[PDB]
């Protein structure tokens, strides 16, 4: 039994673990080398350089509910062990990181806070006006999918405020996209009233699950999936949406003063191209690169039992704005069709555009947008197809990394996509011959049968951070020297390069070998070593390049060759009595004789992978 | 010394090949032991017992288009090699089989014929009135999907007539479901005018592709896929339909006389169950057993480029009639949703029901049905899940067979499903505990990369007949000895039985072993392959039952058990240093020692597949 390469299992890599605390909220602050984690009854300040160095009892603030709040929550039929806890669901930086805004479920009684960055309470004299009640700022239910973002700049009066998407009621009958009251916190006076979507109006929102929100220029964008109201007459479906509000929105003048006057939403299109596209309807997560505010990356799943499938799509801000600039959709009555409105038949100023004072808008614009929140055009995804899609898996969360290779400034986009079963799919995207291409590079086993709940990526520490309900894992982005003991896998990873002279994989450098796009399939040929083995007569010998072949290679074509003086190099054909194929793509040679000696070559995916030289010796 | 799956099937397989003639139309006549085949410019009279015994030049009638018809077709931009040919698309039995009704595309100028059974023309004195022009009876385009059925009984006046679904114009603008003029042949008089769907009305038909038509009781049924008009406001889809007309239909009066007065259609529902069902939207073929008119069997595919799949669904006549007895659908204006009609708004007699003279119907009934052809309820498939479905396959045609082991209590349905790549999937359906189960039994290789165009099954010759554009194949239904060299797969086939004495698979008889429904999982235990191996100490040994594991068994659970003196029977767990799993569900035991001797059992699907006895020789 002979094996060339042993690729180390990944990644059941550092861990932070304080029990099953439902680690579902991340807020990274690289300026303080900290990953803030919201969990059950707790905010942790986790060290970004090495999460294992943090202490469960020191790097924490305990926010457990009062026993009075627990009893009241239990009295309403909720569970003492899980529901009637304070699950932290918002953590946002304030005052240049000196303080944190925190919101938690607080035993189905949402409560929010402002605390110091070191996780201590403000003095009583320093309590921030307008903070305490978390209703509409974060959910009651720890299983909800909500979103929030704290926005310092661009709001009315230049005042900071929280934008949120969550359920605002214990019965879950009031989902809302929300902005808090805006205070002059020094003067202790409320300046701008809160904003909310129209209650009881299924055209604005219908059972949404929120997956992200972003502060970009003059707007705040919200990402969510919801009941597809415009599909009801044809069947049952969930659609994905991006909603947009103007930061300067102050609502209408009198009885519309608390509702958005600029709220618009559009369907998100993630689909396989064709005469009849295959749509992935349910967005699960969205991410934006720190260096690129013009793009969003998102995961989508199907809704059906019979065809489980998931995809990654990206969307450009230009295509989002084209949707919001296109025709509005209209259902003039409950039993009518949904029809486009000619843009020339829309009132002015254009609904959804940021005017100086929405409270001065004509009633005809206010009335229009209240009945036309949905755009007729869907937001097209970049390129013709998803970045990546695959059957029988449920993508959940994702982050994205952008890297440039030094030798010729080649750019690669790397997706880290979590699953409901605790795996990470590592996908690389690149452009060749005018087209967008992607390759699945690796599957990480992070936590068997533990759904990925939250992900973050640090550029200062070159690490991936992954939250499940049981643990946090930290994975180095460049696992070159540890994970790759072979040129084959090394040159396919955009973080790595193969050092032929040293026979090692290293974080990429100019002189190192790399071929992410598979343009030079012989790049590792001179690095393939020939292992010389001695086999006794009649004995069977197991030849394999990997002890366990990486899962992403299991479907590649494998060809074995034997070198003889009479045949030259010829392809080995599997037979029941001589040449057996193993599930790990190995070769078993049965009853080795003199003619079976010599060189064996294993090619995988069109590249020489490993090579053996067999010498046959007597049974001694 | 292993199980070996013999390739199949490029116990016999016969071929009829006269070149690439696009053999796409079958008409089987078992009484005359003949398979009539319609092809390019030709109808063949193929021997049903042995299709290879037929001659390409003797058992054929040449129906090539005239020079003017070719010239006219070529001048319109159509290809002379393929488009401007006479592709036969309808063959039906007439006069107790003494004559055949034939319709061909005739270089985009459809023409029809009545010929003798021996494929010779009638004399001029016998030319049949109303026969000659094939418009609305079979398509212009050889690539069109059309259907037609010649109906002898139940029409007005008791006269025979052709029912068809096809395109009636060269421009393909006018798709029609049609009934020909009904003549009294003896008296040479037209008795009833033709019937057609409402011209250019996209709510009656919208770019349909027809896959079948059936004559049942007082109705003719049509199966087709079409643009989903009731879906247009939500997106772009194709839906599958069953449509129904009363054979007694004579239309309305005045400008309504030439239109159906009983035409209804309903969506066909083939889907995987769930909170969000997965629909297979595009019906490709439909089949009825000769002995059971209460059920329809059909293939469906998806519409997408990515993540494609196909399914087989069955439909019962009780669900079909429930759809046509349900509420009508209605879009009252171009700005209206599609909604059910209140039953109090439905006039009497009920639209779509068969009356003795539809031209005597009240205005309200005729106006209602002409504006409400689509029923609100979809036709639910039996069992609420497909009989079978598979990703990444494109099903085309199918035929179905019914097997009854009658001294036992079992009944089995075997589906033969062709693919666009020349394969046949053989699926068995059976009922246990009242729930429907299915198993993929086999995958025949009929013609690599040649789409299956037409299929027929003969009970008198117990044969499967398959047509592609290049060839015709005839396959014995009982391939028992040729296909299965082992008890394990033999007992799973409803046609076959394992002979314990001769140790061979034979066509099923009483006292042979069979277990299609896996009700006796140890039935083959005494018949499985059993091998004894003497290995030397430290030597490795490869154990395996199959030379190559059959494709259809690649999904089953395989478990290896070891009987040692020190540990009894226990499950072997794979490990790179001791127990190496091999590609064909085998096992390599590495560096055998004394404790590794004994019995090794391989289980597949929970049944013993083969067994090894290892004795270790000390060195
Ligand atoms: C594939 O299968 C098919 C079906 O199985 C095969 O088809 C068979 O093919 C054969 C060969 O062609 C057919 O046989 C032949 O039939 C014809 C027609 O027969 C009928 O008409 C005859 C002529 O009638 C006129 O003339 C007589 C006599 O002068 C006169 O009394 C009549 O009144 C009539 O005259 C008038 O009408 C004319 C217009 O019709 C006017 O122009 C004219 O001026 C007058 O006004 C008639 O004699 C004949 O009668 C016979 O048959 C009937 C029953 O059908 C019977 O009742 C009678 O007593 C007679 O027995 C028919 O009414 C015929 O003309 C052919 O004759 C030649 O061949 C025979 C030998 O077979 C010789 O004896 C003759 O002298 C003559 O040379 C021949 O009989 C057959 O009908 C047909 N079968 C079917 C069911 O269609 C086909 O062959 C297969 N193909 C292959 C490749 O294998
Ligand atoms: C083909 O066969 C398959 C298998 O046999 C079959 O599958 C079932 O498919 C359904 C989905 O279609 C699965 O789910 C159920 O769906 C029921 C229907 O729900 C929808 O339709 C409602 C009615 O709409 C009609 O009326 C309007 C009027 O304006 C019209 O436009 C429409 O076109 C249509 O004609 C619609 O109201 C409803 O929307 C409301 O409710 C949802 C949430 O329920 C909400 O989000 C919306 O905002 C809106 O308020 C929806 O669009 C549904 O009734 C059913 O729910 C009951 O049963 C479940 C248990 O399954 C309970 O949990 C629930 O509380 C309800 O009591 C359920 O949701 C169903 O599971 C499949 N069944 C199987 C066995 O797989 C297909 O339907 C067949 N297809 C066809 C075309 O026939
Ligand atoms: C999400 O993002 C994806 C990818 O970016 C978008 O994908 C595009 O989707 C459309 C479908 O929505 C694909 O098809 C197009 O369909 C339209 C409309 O088609 C229908 O209406 C026609 C007019 O009424 C009718 O003629 C059509 O019927 C014919 O074709 C169908 C099959 O297509 C067939 O079944 C019929 O028998 C007819 O033969 C059909 O009912 C159509 O107008 C488009 O194109 C025509 O014109 C262009 C310009 O010349 C030509 O290039 C086309 O070939 C066609 O002739 C087109 O067919 C379209 O292919 C998808 N595009 C890609 C790149 O994949 C998707 O729309 C987005 N969704 C949303 C909600 O935004
Ligand atoms: C915020 O977003 C998240 C992410 O999208 C939402 O999370 C999803 O929530 C739903 C509903 O809560 C979850 O579904 C449930 O999972 C429960 C646990 O799973 C078991 O079964 C798994 C396998 O499933 C089996 O059944 C199917 C059915 O055909 C078979 O095909 C399959 O082969 C299996 O046999 C096991 O792997 C697992 O170990 C568990 O054993 C289920 O119990 C649950 O079903 C129950 O509830 C149904 C109604 O919800 C009811 O119909 C059933 O009868 C049963 O009572 C259901 O399947 C998703 O798993 C979860 N996704 C992720 C990624 O976490 C979340 O809901 C959302 N928040 C809000 C507030 O909406
Ligand atoms: C009648 O039904 C058949 C079967 O459903 C239809 O055939 C399908 O037709 C499409 C369109 O021509 C074929 O797709 C094409 O594939 C080729 C390459 O394979 C590509 O170059 C084309 O652009 C197109 O994508 C499809 O293969 C074919 N399927 C089979 C099984 O033949 C046919 O179109 C129907 N007839 C009419 C008139 O619609
Ligand atoms: C990350 O921090 C943890 C905890 O400080 C380190 O783990 C300890 O390392 C010391 C020194 O090697 C050992 O004596 C302890 O036994 C380790 N503890 C555990 C729980 O393993 C870890 O080495 C640090 N990782 C890096 C890369 O610095
Ligand atoms: C947590 O942070 C707060 C605020 O930064 C710290 O409080 C201050 O502590 C410094 C150091 O003694 C004083 O000079 C300031 O006057 C304090 N300000 C206030 C408002 O109290 C606090 O000491 C930190 N706590 C821990 C444990 O690190
Ligand atoms: C079916 O018909 C074919 C064709 O007549 C038969 O095959 C021929 O068999 C003879 C006798 O061995 C050969 O000389 C010919 O060369 C064969 N023809 C071809 C085209 O190969 C076949 O035996 C028949 N099968 C039966 C009767 O079961
Ligand atoms: C075929 O039938 C056998 C016998 O009932 C099935 O085996 C049983 O499976 C259940 C559930 O997995 C086990 O609890 C029993 O111990 C099994 N019995 C034996 C004797 O193995 C088997 O699963 C069936 N196979 C298929 C594919 O349905
Ligand atoms: C890499 O390229 C070779 C030939 O250039 C090809 O045979 C092989 O399939 C490719 N592998 C992958 C993973 O694309
Ligand atoms: C056709 O008409 C003739 C006489 O006109 C008659 O004998 C025959 O029965 C009619 N056929 C039918 C089917 O009614
Ligand atoms: Cl939590
Ligand atoms: Cl416009
Ligand atoms: Cl076999
Ligand atoms: Cl043809």
Residue numbers in the entry:
A (entry chain A): 30 to 41, 58 to 665
B (entry chain B): 32 to 41, 56 to 664
Quote the original article.
The secreted semaphorins Sema2a and Sema2b also contain an Ig-like domain positioned C-terminally to their PSI domains. For example, the Sema2a construct used for crystallization contains eight potential sites for N-linked glycosylation (N95, N163, N190, N229, N314, N401, N563 and N658) and the N-linked glycans were clearly visible and unambiguously fitted into the electron density at N95, N163, N190, N229 (only chain B of the dimer), N314 and N563. Our crystal structures of Drosophila semaphorins revealed that the dimeric architecture in Sema1a, Sema2a and Sema2b is covalently secured by an intermolecular sema-to-sema disulfide bond formed by a cysteine from each of the β4B–β4 C loops of the opposing chains (Cys279 in Sema2a). In the class 2 semaphorins, besides the interchain disulfide bond, dimerization is mediated mainly by the top face of the sema domain using five protruding surface loops, which intertwine with each other to form a massive interface burying a total of 4496 Å2. The Ig-like domain of the class 2 semaphorins is also involved in dimerization and contributes 21% to the total buried surface area of the interface. Remarkably, in the Sema2a structure, an N-linked glycan at residue N314 forms intermolecular interactions with the surface residues of the neighbouring chain. Approximately 17% of the total buried surface area between the two chains of the dimers is contributed by this N-linked glycosylation. The simulations revealed a low inter-domain flexibility that is also obvious from the structural superposition of two independent protein chains observed in Sema2a crystal. The Ig-like domain can reorientate relative to the sema–PSI domains by 14° about a hinge point in the PSI-Ig linker. A superposition of Sema2a1–3 and Sema2b1–3 crystal structures unveiled that Sema2a and Sema2b are also highly similar in structure with an rmsd of 1.1 Å over 608 Cα atoms (for Sema2a chain A and Sema2b chain A).
The semaphorins are the largest family of evolutionarily conserved axon guidance cues. The semaphorins signal through their main receptors, plexins, which are single-spanning transmembrane proteins expressed in a variety of cell types, including neurons, cancer cells or endothelial cells. We determined crystal structures of Drosophila Sema1a1–2, Sema1b1–2, Sema2a1–3 and Sema2b1–3 to a 3.6-, 2.8-, 2.1- and 2.5 -Å resolution, respectively. All structures contain the sema domain composed of a seven-bladed β-propeller fold, which is followed by a PSI domain.
